């Protein structure tokens, strides 16, 4: 059910602020896959410091074996969005209700993603 799953380590923060009361864009590089990721995360409700390691997973549906549109107990930062731009080392542009995500990796790593489809975002900081 999970299409892409890898451990990511953050590199730097765009605002670099602890109490800016603003959405923070993070830059995390994939391990053993060499993939760069942009993601807008809320630090106040989900703290993320530099050097932390977190897993990431993407699935079309949260149900087991079908029923598109019970993985909630495993992860803690579930999101929902759609992929609108696929043109690039291919990269993906997924917006979770205005929160842009840029997953830039290799053409072979990302090949089973269609255009204008709904996908989730499973995250856990170990």
């Amino acid at each position: 059910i999970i299409m892409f799953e890898d451990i990511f380590v953050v590199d730097k923060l765009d605002p670099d602020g602890k109490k800016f009361d603003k959405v923070t864009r993070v830059e995390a590089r994939s391990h053993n896959l060499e993939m760069f990721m942009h993601l807008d995360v809320n630090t106040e409700v989900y703290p993320l410091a530099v050097g932390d390691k977190f897993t990431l997973a993407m699935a079309p549906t949260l149900n087991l074996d079908g029923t598109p549109d019970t993985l909630a107990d495993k992860y803690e930062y579930i999101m929902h969005g759609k992929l609108y731009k696929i043109s690039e080392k291919a990269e993906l542009y997924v917006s979770f209700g205005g929160l842009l995500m840029l997953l830039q990796g290799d053409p072979a790593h990302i090949s089973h993603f269609e255009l204008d489809q709904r996908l989730f975002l499973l995250m856990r900081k170990l």
């Binding site: 730097k12 923060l13 670099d16 602020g17 602890k18 109490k19 800016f20 410091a49 530099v50 050097g51």
Partner: protein, 1052 residues
């Protein structure tokens, strides 16, 4: 970990330096921050987003880095990120032990032969900082309020010694620092975002000696009086060439040796008070300037008493032998006790003269001595004052070029910025005005040539009762007609080139042929710039005194102020003719002399040619294959004697006779004949080193020859004639489509030939010319000279970077694989407006121009910046940046003619260099251009008899130890494998030194020829004696304990 300054990534814009300092001292230790600087875009009210902070101890820096890595630094909801910095805020060593405060500094020299030292001037309470990373030692001396900085590098010192001042051999209370060069001298000149913990809000500018008695300029050694230190030896052990021995010294009252004149390190003339000769005194001064004998060791009465009355030749021999001593001599008297016409002929034969060379530095002056060099025209009619001529060069302490920051540093005073002249500027002006006094002489400024202006050199002549400097100046010509400062200097210095003397022609038979001018598109295009006309009888008469068999069709000539190349013609009226646009200045003499006649050398491909030819459609495979075949034929030259002759006949000299060239065609195996095999090996090493330094492609289908014009008017715009000699490759296979075998030795070309010079930075210089063959042109008999048409829209030299017909070389090549489809218009050749004065020259503004030529001299960096920008940005030589660089290069090359600075912008600096450069200190980036591929390919490829013999060997080793040579190869071939700090940065001075040493070895060979001719005088006996010498030098058992030299019998 090399430095202590840490660059903070992001800081709030509303904070001040004090708040950040308080935050750092709260999180870190108390008062652990030394300097904190926040850059500001505006003057004092707009700080930037980052800041740089300097810590006192590296442990504090490591702790701060650890805290920043864990994101434990939060100052006003901002996460501070720490990164390494490029340069320290303040050049202060991290180790507190190296910082020495309130110590005694004194200067002096090894005055006595024994363990004695003389103190000239002593300073107390000075500050000494040892910078290991910067490889320099700083001395802060406070004198009359304002402090001065004395900078001594690690290469400045040659040997470190420790001494004592209390008188106890066990204790170490002093340190000797023997200096080879002079130390740099600085001066201190006269807040919300800069803490700095101290009063470091000033700047350092280079100044002259600040001592009243000028003790620094006459002292070659420094002594540091410091207290006894248990671990001080470990700190002092870091200096290069440290001796682990204990030495004791005594103080000698040497305050009497104090000179208040500008030229400090010279001896006093009033002390002698006798009829001492000038040559011996000059030799003694040169020896004292060298690190051989100190000042007081040669200022005693006994030495001059012994040297006063003796034999002159023996005195010169012993003086030069003492100068040739490998180490420093302490007692000259003991050494000199234990040791015990032709100028005119040399000038007439090969123009051999002994010229004195002087080096003026901001600290002192160095006299090199009577070095042999090629003679110029000015000494031909003034050969009696051979010692009055002295070459003066203004260099730095390291004998390098003076930087732009050392002269006229900029400062913002008022609304606009105005440069401020430093003390070195005034020192140079005073030296040029008052002059240099050496013994019973005073040298005056005569003139400077075009080459000397680019090398910071100038001629000086000592005024005499017979002829003075003004007499020579007015004898050369009347320069009051020129109202331009640069033009007058150029015309006064143009008559100093090396030339061969010929017959004298009066001013009765000269023509005034009118010239041709065309004005199209509102632009003045003149075809005849320096062209001329010559007859056949004149060529025969001028080629007889130079030993020239074939008569060239063109040769560069200059006489009576005129300058330009002249061409032959078969319809001449009389011996000589003159045109209009050739008179530079009026002269009182019309002596004829010739510099160069013809050189049919093979063409070479420099970096700019490939850089500008890589856009028309030329691929990288062609150059790659050419480099591959070049390296293949270079590697095969060692074990194959067939390739050696073919390379020597196609690399340097189409028709050259040499001992190695003759033996290459017929010789033994490369394993045998070590004298020739090692020469081939060193030649290959020199070739590969030259290829690594710069691109030089050997192309056999092209030559380098000058061009002229004929009074025919048949050739149109785009039609020229190409004719050159036939090389080995051309003679082996003359059957070609673009090659016409007009004669056995000369072959015509009908291919597409382009014209290119050495400096080229514009894509429009490539003008494809179709060569045609005409019987009428061949009837005139033109050889070694390309023919340019008379009529056309624009002259050919104008499209070739706006040049003239002044005997300049042109690159020709009858290649067929080039791409002539793309054509680009050339750039405009219109120069800047001339500057004319309302008054005559009072000899002061010329000095101002000469000194100001060093400032804003960006001729050498424009080409490097253009190459870097072409290698970085694709589609090179197409953007406006390349056009701007070419225009700036043209304006800079016009600086020597018109007083127009280049004005190099700051934003056009490259700040990056490719791999194929010698700038190891500067950052290196991997280039992916054609030059990068070529450099990678090169990297992959690379990865009675007894007495004469003894005399010759002694002379050769004397020359080797005088010029610093350690092996026979580097002195015979003229190429030195080892370089100094100043001989590697520039190539002009190194080339001049190579020419001088080549002249010296040629003179030695001529003397050997004379000795061999006078020794025997019998033909059969001469052959027998040569065979006997070869046999003696070939037998290993005949070698003595000394180094036996095998280069003596090889004479032909």
């Amino acid at each position: 970990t090399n430095r202590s300054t840490v660059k903070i990534s992001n800081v709030p814009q509303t904070i001040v330096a004090d708040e950040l300092l308080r935050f750092l001292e709260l999180h870190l230790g108390e008062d652990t921050v030394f300097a904190l600087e926040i850059p500001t875009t505006r003057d004092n009210w707009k700080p930037r987003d980052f800041a740089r902070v300097q810590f006192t101890t590296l442990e504090v820096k490591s702790r701060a880095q650890l805290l920043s890595s864990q994101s434990k630094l939060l100052f006003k909801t901002h996460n501070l990120r720490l990164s390494e910095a490029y340069d320290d805020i303040i050049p202060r060593p991290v180790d507190p032990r190296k910082r020495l405060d309130d110590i005694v500094l004194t200067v002096g020299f090894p005055e006595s032969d024994e363990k004695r030292f003389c103190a000239l001037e002593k300073w107390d309470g000075v500050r000494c900082w040892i910078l290991t990373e910067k490889r320099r030692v700083e001395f802060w001396v406070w004198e009359s309020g304002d402090c001065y900085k004395i900078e001594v590098r690690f290469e400045d010192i040659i040997e470190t010694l420790s001494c004592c001042v209390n008188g106890d051999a066990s204790e170490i209370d002093a340190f000797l620092l023997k200096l080879k060069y002079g130390p740099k001298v600085f001066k201190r000149v006269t807040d919300r975002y800069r803490f700095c913990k101290e009063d470091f809000d000033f700047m350092w500018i280079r100044t002259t000696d600040f001592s009243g008695s000028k003790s620094i300029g006459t002292s070659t050694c420094f002594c540091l009086e410091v207290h006894n230190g248990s671990t001080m030896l470990d700190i002092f052990s870091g200096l290069p060439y440290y001796r682990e021995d204990t030495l004791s010294l005594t103080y000698v009252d040497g305050k009497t040796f104090a000179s208040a004149a500008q030229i400090v390190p010279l001896l006093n003339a009033a002390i002698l008070g006798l009829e001492f000769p000038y040559e011996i005194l000059f030799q003694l001064n040169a020896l004292v300037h060298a690190q051989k004998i100190s000042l007081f060791a040669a200022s005693d009465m006994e030495l001059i008493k012994i040297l006063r009355g003796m034999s002159l030749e023996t005195a010169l021999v012993i003086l030069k032998k003492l100068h040739q001593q490998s180490s420093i001599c302490y007692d000259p008297v003991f050494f000199v006790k234990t040791q015990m016409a032709s100028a005119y002929k040399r000038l007439t034969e090969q123009n051999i003269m002994s010229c004195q060379r002087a080096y003026v530095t901001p600290s002192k002056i160095y006299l090199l001595g009577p070095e042999l060099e090629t003679a110029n025209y000015v000494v031909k009619n003034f050969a009696e004052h051979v010692s009055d001529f002295m070459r003066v060069t203004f260099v730095e302490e390291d004998w390098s070029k003076l930087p732009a920051n050392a002269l006229s540093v900029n400062s913002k005073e008022g609304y606009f910025v105005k440069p401020s002249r430093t003390n070195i500027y005034n020192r140079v002006l005073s030296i040029l005005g008052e002059g240099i006094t050496v013994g019973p002489k005073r040298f005056e400024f005569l003139a400077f040539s075009a080459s000397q202006l680019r090398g910071n050199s100038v001629w000086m002549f000592a005024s005499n009762e017979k002829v003075k400097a003004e007499d020579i100046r007015e004898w050369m010509g009347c320069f009051r007609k020129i109202r331009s400062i640069s033009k007058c200097a150029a015309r006064m210095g143009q008559l100093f080139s090396a030339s061969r003397q010929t017959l004298i022609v009066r001013a009765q038979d000269v023509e005034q042929i009118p010239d041709i001018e065309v004005t199209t598109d509102g632009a003045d295009y003149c075809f005849s710039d320096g062209i001329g006309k010559i007859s056949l009888a004149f060529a025969k008469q001028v080629a007889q005194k130079c030993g020239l068999s074939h008569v060239p069709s063109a040769f560069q000539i200059r006489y009576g102020g005129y300058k330009g190349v002249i061409a032959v013609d078969r319809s001449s009226f009389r011996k000589l003719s003159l045109r209009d646009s050739m008179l530079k200045f009026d002269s009182n003499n019309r002596m004829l002399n010739v510099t160069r006649w013809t050189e049919s050398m093979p063409c070479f491909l420099n970096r700019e040619i490939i850089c500008l030819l890589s856009t028309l459609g030329i691929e990288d495979a062609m150059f790659e294959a050419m480099q591959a075949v070049h390296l293949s034929m270079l590697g095969n030259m060692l074990e194959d004697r067939d390739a050696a002759l073919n390379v020597l006949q196609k690399l340097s000299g189409e028709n050259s006779k040499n001992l190695l060239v003759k033996m290459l065609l017929q010789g033994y195996a490369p394993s045998s004949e070590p004298y020739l095999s090692m020469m081939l090996r060193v030649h290959h090493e020199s070739q590969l080193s030259e290829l690594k330094s710069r691109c030089r492609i050997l192309v056999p289908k092209g030559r380098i020859l000058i061009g002229c014009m004929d009074e025919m008017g048949i050739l149109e715009y785009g039609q020229v004639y190409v004719r050159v000699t036939l090389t080995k490759a051309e003679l082996k296979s003359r059957d070609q489509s673009y090659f016409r075998k007009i004669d056995e030795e000369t072959s015509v070309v009908i291919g597409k030939v382009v014209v290119t010079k050495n400096p080229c930075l514009h894509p429009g210089d490539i003008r494809v010319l179709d060569a045609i063959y005409e019987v009428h042109f061949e009837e005139k008999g033109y050889l070694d000279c390309i023919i340019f048409p008379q009529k056309g829209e624009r002259p050919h030299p104008n499209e070739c970077s706006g040049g003239d017909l002044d005997g300049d070389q042109f690159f020709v090549s009858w290649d067929e694989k080039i791409i002539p489809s793309e054509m680009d218009p050339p750039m405009d050749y219109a120069g800047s407006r001339p500057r004319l004065m309302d008054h005559d020259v009072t000899l002061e503004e010329i000095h101002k121009f000469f000194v100001d030529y060093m400032i804003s001299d960006t001729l050498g960096v424009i080409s490097t910046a253009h190459l870097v920008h072409a290698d970085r940005d694709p589609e090179k030589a197409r953007s406006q940046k390349c056009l701007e660089l070419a225009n700036l290069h043209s304006r800079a090359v016009d600086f020597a003619k018109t007083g127009a600075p280049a004005e190099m912008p700051y934003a056009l600096k490259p700040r990056e260099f490719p791999d194929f450069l010698e700038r190891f200190e500067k950052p290196t980036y991997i280039s992916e251009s054609v030059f990068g591929k070529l450099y990678r390919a090169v990297k992959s490829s690379l990865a009675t008899a007894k007495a004469h013999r003894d005399m010759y060997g002694e002379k050769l080793t004397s020359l080797m130890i005088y010029y610093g040579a350690a092996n026979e190869e580097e002195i015979l071939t003229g190429i030195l494998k080892t370089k100094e700090m100043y001989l590697a940065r520039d190539n002009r001075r190194y080339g001049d030194m190579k020419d001088r040493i080549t002249l010296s070895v040629k003179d030695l060979h001529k003397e050997a020829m004379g000795w061999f001719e006078k020794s025997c005088e019998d033909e059969q006996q001469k052959k027998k004696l040569a065979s006997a010498w070869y046999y003696v030098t070939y037998n290993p058992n005949h070698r003595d304990e000394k180094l036996t030299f095998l280069s003596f019998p090889w004479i032909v």
